[PDB]
Design an enzyme around this catalytic site. Structure first.
Site, PDB file in Angstrom:
ATOM      1  N   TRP B 130      45.400  67.861 -17.644  1.00 20.61           N
ATOM      2  CA  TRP B 130      45.457  67.319 -16.276  1.00 20.61           C
ATOM      3  C   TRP B 130      45.386  65.775 -16.317  1.00 20.61           C
ATOM      4  O   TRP B 130      44.478  65.227 -16.904  1.00 20.61           O
ATOM      5  CB  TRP B 130      44.348  67.981 -15.440  1.00 20.61           C
ATOM      6  CG  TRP B 130      44.096  67.451 -14.111  1.00 20.61           C
ATOM      7  CD1 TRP B 130      44.954  67.423 -13.036  1.00 20.61           C
ATOM      8  CD2 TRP B 130      42.867  66.896 -13.663  1.00 20.61           C
ATOM      9  NE1 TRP B 130      44.329  66.841 -11.946  1.00 20.61           N
ATOM     10  CE2 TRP B 130      43.049  66.508 -12.311  1.00 20.61           C
ATOM     11  CE3 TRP B 130      41.634  66.653 -14.287  1.00 20.61           C
ATOM     12  CZ2 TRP B 130      42.034  65.920 -11.567  1.00 20.61           C
ATOM     13  CZ3 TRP B 130      40.640  66.050 -13.557  1.00 20.61           C
ATOM     14  CH2 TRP B 130      40.838  65.691 -12.204  1.00 20.61           C
ATOM     15  N   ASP B 211      35.107  70.680 -19.627  1.00 20.65           N
ATOM     16  CA  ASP B 211      35.509  70.425 -18.271  1.00 20.65           C
ATOM     17  C   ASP B 211      35.980  71.706 -17.657  1.00 20.65           C
ATOM     18  O   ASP B 211      37.097  72.182 -17.923  1.00 20.65           O
ATOM     19  CB  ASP B 211      36.612  69.396 -18.195  1.00 20.65           C
ATOM     20  CG  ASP B 211      37.013  69.096 -16.751  1.00 20.65           C
ATOM     21  OD1 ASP B 211      36.165  69.101 -15.838  1.00 20.65           O
ATOM     22  OD2 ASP B 211      38.211  68.885 -16.503  1.00 20.65           O
ATOM     23  N   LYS B 246      37.981  74.718  -6.411  1.00 19.72           N
ATOM     24  CA  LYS B 246      38.816  75.920  -6.415  1.00 19.72           C
ATOM     25  C   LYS B 246      38.032  77.184  -6.128  1.00 19.72           C
ATOM     26  O   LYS B 246      38.465  78.030  -5.359  1.00 19.72           O
ATOM     27  CB  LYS B 246      39.580  76.044  -7.730  1.00 19.72           C
ATOM     28  CG  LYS B 246      40.657  74.991  -7.902  1.00 19.72           C
ATOM     29  CD  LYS B 246      40.058  73.733  -8.501  1.00 19.72           C
ATOM     30  CE  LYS B 246      41.109  72.641  -8.604  1.00 19.72           C
ATOM     31  NZ  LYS B 246      40.761  71.634  -9.640  1.00 19.72           N
TER      32      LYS B 246
HETATM   33  C1  LIG Z   1      40.781  70.506 -15.229  1.00 22.36           C
HETATM   34  C2  LIG Z   1      40.342  69.813 -13.970  1.00 22.36           C
HETATM   35  N1  LIG Z   1      39.192  69.132 -14.041  1.00 22.36           N
HETATM   36  C3  LIG Z   1      38.711  68.472 -12.979  1.00 22.36           C
HETATM   37  C4  LIG Z   1      39.392  68.472 -11.780  1.00 22.36           C
HETATM   38  C5  LIG Z   1      38.760  67.705 -10.670  1.00 22.36           C
HETATM   39  O1  LIG Z   1      38.782  68.509  -9.507  1.00 22.36           O
HETATM   40  P1  LIG Z   1      37.706  68.261  -8.344  1.00 22.36           P
HETATM   41  O2  LIG Z   1      38.520  68.509  -7.094  1.00 22.36           O
HETATM   42  O3  LIG Z   1      37.193  66.828  -8.493  1.00 22.36           O
HETATM   43  O4  LIG Z   1      36.658  69.288  -8.645  1.00 22.36           O
HETATM   44  C6  LIG Z   1      40.597  69.156 -11.654  1.00 22.36           C
HETATM   45  C7  LIG Z   1      41.360  69.165 -10.367  1.00 22.36           C
HETATM   46  N2  LIG Z   1      42.537  69.609 -10.301  1.00 22.36           N
HETATM   47  C8  LIG Z   1      43.308  69.619  -9.073  1.00 22.36           C
HETATM   48  C9  LIG Z   1      44.198  68.384  -9.114  1.00 22.36           C
HETATM   49  C10 LIG Z   1      43.803  67.202  -8.274  1.00 22.36           C
HETATM   50  O5  LIG Z   1      42.606  67.088  -7.909  1.00 22.36           O
HETATM   51  O6  LIG Z   1      44.722  66.378  -8.021  1.00 22.36           O
HETATM   52  C11 LIG Z   1      44.341  70.675  -9.213  1.00 22.36           C
HETATM   53  O7  LIG Z   1      44.010  71.826  -8.837  1.00 22.36           O
HETATM   54  O8  LIG Z   1      45.470  70.318  -9.702  1.00 22.36           O
HETATM   55  C12 LIG Z   1      41.073  69.834 -12.777  1.00 22.36           C
HETATM   56  O9  LIG Z   1      42.261  70.516 -12.708  1.00 22.36           O
END
Ligand SMILES: Cc1[nH+]cc(COP(=O)(O)O)c(/C=N/[C@@H](CC(=O)O)C(=O)O)c1O
Ligand SMILES: *Cc1c(COP(=O)(O)O)cnc(C)c1O
Ligand SMILES: [Mg+2]
Lengths: 398, 398
Positions: B130, B211, B246
């Site tokens: 990511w 992560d 998520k």
């Molecule tokens: C692997 C991973 N780690 C951390 C995060 C951080 O997510 P948060 O919302 O701060 O808990 C995300 C978010 N992925 C989303 C992408 C984005 O935030 O643009 C996604 O579902 O693609 C990840 O896909």
């Protein structure tokens, strides 16, 4: 693994709430916290927040990511509040703005930005200032210094030395300024003084970074922003970090804004994308709930008008606790000058007690203040004002 | 003033939401973004999440600051979920844990801590990963490289290339690892591969930064945490950033946690201490609203128990779109094998379409994916699987 890691400096405030809470005096009074309490001594929930929050709970909605910049309306809300409804600079689109995780987050983002693009800038903060100013800019690898502010000899700004100190500064050096309601001192510049300061910032090509966290606790909304609106009118490369923590009773919801006033629409586009990229590498996007509250209250004219009135209520309740305090001190220390108490503004006051007298309030009467002499004027209300006032009289005479 | 500042290219996917949103086609589908959608293609609000916010709204309560570390309860839910209820490591007091602004804020705080305290460590991430991983670690001045991971030849791991790459690294180099549900590829290590990695991570004395954003979406809560617990049992100095975006469907509210596993109680206190310090100088303290939702669901056994059903529901629905897509494709292009679409786990799949094939899917069909072939399986449901599945069968005999 980690034995190389030092124990933190520690929380100066929680060690202070912990000491107070422990304090055995039945008549104990906490003037040490940086927080608005009403005349019943509790944290208020604002009526307009309460309505906004009712809207948010009806219906409970799906919860997408906010844009990296925060809600369109939140963004606008900070701008109108700071630069005036339908301000020229806003029409011309000359301001890049983001919602932020409180004032703190806005400091953090502005600082990180100034670090990336002006890695040569030192930052000066006022002496004294809210210590989180320094830890945030130092946290980015900026060199932090202080500029001369509170004249401990008089209770006033040592204006001359301050000005002359700016004269020694470099192109692009950053000044962290308090447009109103100084923290910790409550000591404010006059307009004619802001006019002086600003011409200096113009002449030496410096960056004014204004951190406004008590808008409306001062004189009034429009007036509190005078420095900001003047700076704009003068073509300064203005940074403004602003906070809703105190003036919405929304500390926990972390709502705030960072504004950067640029020369041209194209520079606005540049700064804005960069504010976005910075938010992205920090925390990604700001919390929805707080964002919706700011969005609703600022943009719904009726709720906004309600909001403003609650804010003035607090401004006024402080002013009375302020005047009610000075009258008891002059009544009983016939010689002395206590004008500074009501000449001050905002939630704080340097009482001009010595570290020793501040100690004696605590040990003799259960009254907690900070040792630089800072008191939170909002901590005072009618059920404790005489007790504090006479206690101060005892310590002050001796 | 700012002529010299760069245009920010933008968050690459969000401009793609704009182009699909732009797309005229009746049968348009958006499989690019990382959001979980229900069987109706809508963002849901979890039944347990509903209940919680009902409680938050009743009464609307004052909004003070949360501690720097977030709610003691939020902090506990993170810990229990990740290392297991009343786990040896938790009883012993050896995990320093703070609430964070998303997983992203966890990665950030972690990264800074590594930067302040282990300044010669380089960071390694999966090829690919990511994007924000790199953006975040690079943003704290860490040098980021890639470890060999996904194999274009096989749609599998390049396991040998990987360990081999690991072997060349220094003491205290940091590895960014997805404990399950890898983004973007969906392609996961097996248990024995995990033990093997951890072994190398041990013998070469490296730091695992796990992560974890899709816990529950791969196999089940416990299995998804396997690498995390194993590393724990291994006595490695693990960092774990975890996100509730998520699996509480709370993307907007910004709720995550960062955990660091240390050898001694004394070390926990130092590290934990550095973490609050690190939070202080970025944003002071996290959002109350999100923080209450995590606290509430996590520690109300009935809601907690409900909540988990809801995740496994979500896990199941994706597994069904997964199998359905393969049935359609395996049935209609007889020779080549698609086992990868179900050998993959979580929200994402690397479909293996070339950018030529990917473009054509948008251009001829209005079905929107990333150029690297990343699709979000949750974007699929019984109303469009049949449409999308064919657009693919089609674009593949070109
Ligand atoms: C692997 C991973 N780690 C951390 C995060 C951080 O997510 P948060 O919302 O701060 O808990 C995300 C978010 N992925 C989303 C992408 C984005 O935030 O643009 C996604 O579902 O693609 C990840 O896909
Ligand atoms: C209290 C205070 C803030 C608070 O900002 P938050 O991060 O919203 O709590 C910012 N700046 C100053 C000068 C303050 O006194
Ligand atoms: Mg840095």
């Amino acid at each position: 693994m980690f034995e190389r890691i030092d124990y933190y400096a520690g929380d100066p405030i929680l060690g202070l709430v912990e000491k107070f809470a422990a304090d055995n005096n039945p008549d104990k009074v906490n003037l040490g916290i940086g927080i608005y309490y009403d005349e019943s001594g509790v944290m208020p929930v604002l009526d307009c927040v309460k309505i906004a929050e009712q809207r948010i709970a009806d219906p409970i909605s799906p919860r997408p990511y906010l844009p990296m910049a925060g809600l369109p309306g939140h963004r606008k809300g900070c701008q109108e509040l700071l630069f005036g409804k339908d301000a020229p600079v806003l029409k011309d689109g000359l301001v890049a703005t983001i919602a932020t995780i409180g004032g703190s987050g806005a400091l953090k983002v502005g600082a990180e930005f100034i670090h990336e693009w002006f890695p040569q800038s030192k930052c000066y903060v006022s002496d004294p200032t809210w210590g989180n100013h320094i830890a945030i800019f130092e946290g980015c690898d900026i060199e932090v210094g202080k500029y001369p502010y509170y004249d401990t000899a008089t209770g006033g700004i040592k204006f001359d030395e301050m000005i002359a100190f700016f004269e020694t500064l470099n192109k692009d050096d950053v000044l962290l300024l308090h447009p109103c309601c100084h923290n910790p001192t409550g000591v404010d510049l006059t307009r004619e003084q802001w006019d002086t300061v600003l011409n200096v910032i113009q002449e030496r090509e410096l960056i004014p970074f204004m951190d406004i966290a008590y808008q409306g606790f001062g004189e009034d909304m429009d007036s509190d922003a005078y420095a900001i609106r003047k700076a704009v009118d003068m073509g300064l490369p203005l940074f403004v970090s602003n906070s809703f923590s105190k003036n919405l009773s929304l500390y926990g919801e972390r709502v705030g804004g960072l504004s950067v006033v640029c020369p041209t629409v194209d520079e606005t586009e540049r700064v804005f994308g960069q504010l976005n990229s910075t938010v992205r590498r920090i925390y990604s996007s700001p919390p929805s709930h707080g964002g919706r509250v700011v969005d609703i209250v600022m943009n719904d004219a009726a709720l906004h008008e309600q909001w403003v009135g609650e804010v003035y209520a607090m401004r006024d309740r402080i002013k009375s606790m302020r005047t009610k305090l000075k009258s008891v001190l002059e009544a009983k220390i016939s010689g002395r000058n206590f004008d500074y108490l009501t000449a001050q503004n905002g939630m704080f006051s340097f009482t001009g007690l010595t570290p020793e007298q501040v100690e004696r309030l605590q040990s003799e009467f259960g009254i907690y203040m900070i040792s630089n002499s800072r008191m939170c004027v909002a901590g005072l209300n009618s059920s404790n004002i005489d007790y504090v006032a006479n206690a101060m009289v005892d310590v002050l005479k001796d």
